[PDB]
Swiss-Prot record:
Protein's UniProt name: Lysozyme C
Positions in coiled-coil regions: none
Gene that this sequence comes from: LYZ
Family: Belongs to the glycosyl hydrolase 22 family.
Main location: secreted
Secreted as UniProt keyword: yes
Species whose genome carries this gene: Gallus gallus
Length: 129
């Protein structure tokens, strides 16, 4: 599913992501924009052989199982395919664990490089939330 901007903001808020660990909704929407362009089916293979899955490009090295990332963990206790669903619940629950892991949203390099420090409220501006 390719979400609209406000549509994703609303779904993220529904699932408790707004201000989670102090990160406002616009930070989450901005991260999803640059990770997946709001496409739940996005996948990308990393140099190390792991793969990133879903709207927030969650990595199989630590967070989900895809059966083909040697030496990896599955700390969200989910198949990586769960992260590609039109229903964002699995991605949101796993992102909550990732953002709690010590480095906040810096876990998402694209968030650090493209969202951090910017006017992230632009991403939810206008939305009925
Ligand atoms: Cl957009
Ligand atoms: Cl915001
Ligand atoms: Cl594996
Ligand atoms: Cl393969
Ligand atoms: Cl594990
Ligand atoms: Cl699995
Ligand atoms: Cl949803
Ligand atoms: Cl933080
Ligand atoms: Na894994």
């Amino acid at each position: 599913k390719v979400f609209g901007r406000c549509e994703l903001a609303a779904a993220m808020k529904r699932h408790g992501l707004d201000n989670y660990r102090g990160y406002s909704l616009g930070n989450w929407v901005c991260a999803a924009k640059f990770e997946s362009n709001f496409n739940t089916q996005a996948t990308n293979r990393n140099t190390d052989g792991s793969t990133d899955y879903g709207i927030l490009q969650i990595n199989s090295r630590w967070w989900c199982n895809d059966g083909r990332t040697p030496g990896s963990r599955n700390l969200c206790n989910i198949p990586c395919s769960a992260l590609l669903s039109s229903d964002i619940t699995a991605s949101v629950n796993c992102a909550k664990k990732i953002v709690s892991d010590g480095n906040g949203m810096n876990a998402w390099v694209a968030w650090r490089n493209r969202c951090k420090g910017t006017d992230v409220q632009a991403w939810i501006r206008g939305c009925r939330l």
